[PDB]
Amino acid sequence: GALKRAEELKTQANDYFKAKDYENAIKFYSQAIELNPSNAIYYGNRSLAYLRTECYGYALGDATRAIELDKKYIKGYYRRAASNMALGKFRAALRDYETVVKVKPHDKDAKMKYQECNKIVKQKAFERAEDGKVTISFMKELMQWYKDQKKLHRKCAYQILVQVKEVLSKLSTLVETTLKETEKITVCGDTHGQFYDLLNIFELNGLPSETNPYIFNGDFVDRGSFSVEVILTLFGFKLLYPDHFHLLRGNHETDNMNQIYGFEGEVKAKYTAQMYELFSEVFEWLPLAQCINGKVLIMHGGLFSEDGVTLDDIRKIERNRQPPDSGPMCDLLWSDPQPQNGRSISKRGVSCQFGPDVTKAFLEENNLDYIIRSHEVKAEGYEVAHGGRCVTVFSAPNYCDQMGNKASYIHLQGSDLRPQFHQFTAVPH
């Protein structure tokens, strides 16, 4: 039937590797696999063409299928550990490396790479070895403090968490803020514990106040070494300006991911274990989305898989609980757009992807102009999709000190709700 369309894309896709044509090699690899997703040889050949383009995350899973279909495929077995090492995490690469001597005899160069992999886990192991109300003087002092390292006093942090939880618990799931004709507002994307970039944001765009309202689209922690400082400063900002500072819940404000992506470890290193428990308690009360002028609706995740989805349904959401595996809040913290029409399985493994038709239907049914959603890293710091109906804004320049991408924040005006992107850069810490 279709067995002939297997080797015809072998001499073509693999030939582009000789001509350094990794792009067309990947494009043609997405064709033989498309019409023959049962050959481990092609699943292995795709790994080299996709790994040389500094894309390790998808290659990590691509190299696994070349092993499941053929456990004697050392060619596709080495590259899984190579991608794991490129990511930098231990265990998986080391386990893959040590699961090669049980299938081969005492061959040359077989154990040298295993020893070399061992020689870094040892390094990792050695690495293991005023009146409680917040004031302008207090915010400036804490800002300078965090700029000069140093942790805040435990009592002050506990009071900040208690007050911010009390303030946030009185807000609805869908916060409705009315913006006047004048008096613009600032929307920022993911922060991810980049305090020295938040410093640049506040210096370039001005400190938050009643005249310069601010709102951040989640992801204030994880994947950064200054998550605690970022989130504590943002909580102080919320306390000082409850009606001009808005925090939206994000996918990185969840315990299942705080415990894996450094925030729990950072809190336990800088403070006690219950102190992260109070972080979790105050995190569950964060709003999931915010609507401006009944026209611009912003959220950290985006649209849902369900077709109905109304603003009243958004308001009737129990925030104070862990995100479900699926449903409204899961997509409210995990969805992504798709250039083609219709829904699809999300690349992250949870929630789904929404097409331009989904965005148009949602905007028409909810009487909204466009939607803003970050959830993602963008090269230019912002992205326009779905014909302008989908806006992505990123406020985390040089995400993990490796991406080296610009960042941006959106100015929104009451007279003209058109997004005004303003870009900033690395600003090394």
Partner: protein
Amino acid sequence: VKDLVVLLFETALLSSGFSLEDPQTHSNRIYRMIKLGLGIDE
């Protein structure tokens, strides 16, 4: 570098006739080092 310099200072301060300010921290460091060397993790 911070861990290395701290441990070197503690050991050198110990092996010169002085007395540590708090033996508990040094003992805990040694116990954690042995536990790392004999595979308990966590």
